[PDB]
Amino acid sequence: LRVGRKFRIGRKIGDIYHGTNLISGEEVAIRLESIRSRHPQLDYESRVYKYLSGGVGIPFIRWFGREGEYNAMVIDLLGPSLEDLFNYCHRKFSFKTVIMLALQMICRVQYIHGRSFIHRDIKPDNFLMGVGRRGSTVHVIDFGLSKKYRDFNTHRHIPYRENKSLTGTARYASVNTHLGIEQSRRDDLESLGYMLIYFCKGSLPWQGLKATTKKQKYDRILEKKLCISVETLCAGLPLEFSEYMNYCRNLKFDERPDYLYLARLFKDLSIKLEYHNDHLFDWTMLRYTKAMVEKNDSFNKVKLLAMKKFASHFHYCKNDDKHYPTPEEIKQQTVQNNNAAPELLSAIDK
Template sequence: MAPRKTATAKSGSKGAAATKSGSKGAPKKRVAANGFKLPDPIAPGVVVKDVAKQNWKIGKSIGVGGFGEIYLASSNTEVPVDSGADYVIKVEPHSNGPLFAEMHCYMRLARPEHIEGWMKEKRLKRLGMPKFFGSGSFEYNNHKYRFMVMERFGNDLQKILEHHSKRLSFKTVYQVGIQILDVLEYIHSKEYVHADIKASNLLVGHKPGTENQVFLVDFGLARYYANEGCHKEYKYDQRKAHDGTIEFTSRDAHIGAHSRRGDLEILGYNMTQWLCSRLPWEDNLQDCNYVFAQKRKCMENISAFVSQCFPDTVPQGLQEYLEYVVSLAFDEKPDYEHCRNILREGLRARGYRDDGKLVFTSATPVPPSRKPKSRQGRKKTFKRRSEEEENLGDAKKQSEHKDLSKDIHVGNQSEQTMPDGLFFR
């Protein structure tokens, strides 16, 4: 059996030097678009040890992010890491820092026993919270790196969107929304907000049986919204203003404040974009204050906002969801089940069952006014139907909901000075 490659303080010697592909000079430094230094390529077969003394073997690279690189990994160090590996390792230079913050967040939120305990308490069959398996530091080619071991996932929703004309089916958007509300309820219970929900941070499961499960990843911008039950105050913080991804950042985050309602608002913007392909403020994303002002305008008149995005037919339940988000006070705990029920009722009104299945097709659902005809007594045909059509249930009459429109509350905080006079109440 060939000897293992092990990353240690001595890995810059003979064995590690051989990974420079025969180059006589020092390898050129790799830098991401955001300016962070990327790690030099790690040779497949290197073994690293986490703080719990668990060994992990690194496989091939499967992606490069804004501050590090992601490799396949295995806990079995005796054989090469194959393409079916169930783990990945995120690696960044020790001098960077983003992975350090994310790593500590995962340590508090993503331990398997914590996730499984929550699922048992809430009687959930699944939860799209990624699991954390280990972390540590190592030296390779005389450079120091930190790493984190996570479970492996499949494609992200952004890639799927790009293959479907930047839109997802109504059913899939609402099923994903329900799943993400489950995850938000979990992380909010730990006094964290995610703050960067978007399609590229939503990954479909890799393991068999998780094909219809979406996982919320990348907690690099996650932060505490409270400390031991005491919510942070609503105030302008220039250092954190406009944090997140500008298209989806919540109005709270635009002023540097973070809240649970902010995460729900970000999810609402995502669902809107996935259904109509473009948000009204995407014409000038370089101007953060313009985007903020447009969001304030749209959320002050949600009926006009959804009509602008959907001139033909407004998706059932979307307006009600956004109105509920607007009704929340800055420090108020959301009613997650109410939000899920809004989306479930939207599915039922369009003739779908809440079966949790994700359907990445362009199939057209049965309109709510047309009840699918019974197949009983019908002559059997061999016309192939899409999976989405197979999941259609009986369209049911939608019950009237209470008007949730109310004034926006932010507690008793005084107004804060904002750039260009912008202030969200």
């Protein structure tokens, strides 16, 4: 079970495994693919990782190639995905966490696009926090569906094309992806927009649909994405979220996104909400509070204490809201958070 010269395959995670550099003892991750795969992808994915190497929050690939009857890829060991953490937090994130996530993910996408690639599978499962002290950094994974959208030298954009079949995940797919249009930079950013809204509101209104065929499900999703107003979609969110969505839906096919303009939506908002970009995420504070306590109902209790102790960090979308709340309206929740409630309030101060 040796890979390259110095890496040993350990337990499954997991065709991805824990691994170990035998010289240094560093824990890594190791992805295997059979050379009898009908649809090889790992060599392509390795090569994209390698071309993207050096960008912030891009997993660093340590080794890749053929080993025995496997293609193998040795890469940084990362932590939980955003979908895992979303579940850990019972499927809603605070505005602060979504903002801090948005700021990092926009930079990740900007970096990838600046290397002439589009990801094409932007979704919560494909962003992981680092392990340990790197838990503060959002990383991007799974480049198997990525694609070069312009020439490396001339920056000549790939041609406008129609009739493409949907790839990959319908829930976060852009409207133009549903319509069969060649994906480009705008579509990565639109998907990231659906994620942000999903994180804030707890769901997207086209989840849980059923149909008689694959195509019919996709089209029922498309109709909701097309026919729902941005106001309904973004109900209860500060205006920045609908402006982000409106911006992505208006980008032309070959158009260079103004990434700084989009980052400024969230950075300017963070300042108005009095959030420091301190990488203190919802899970970080929930996990910490539970640690102190232990010295679904149980979670609700931990959460109540966390939101009391960290009253100015935990502001949530109210899904009954029909309007976009102002920052002052959102910050009223700090007062409510401190107004909640003996031996437990004592332990929390401690």
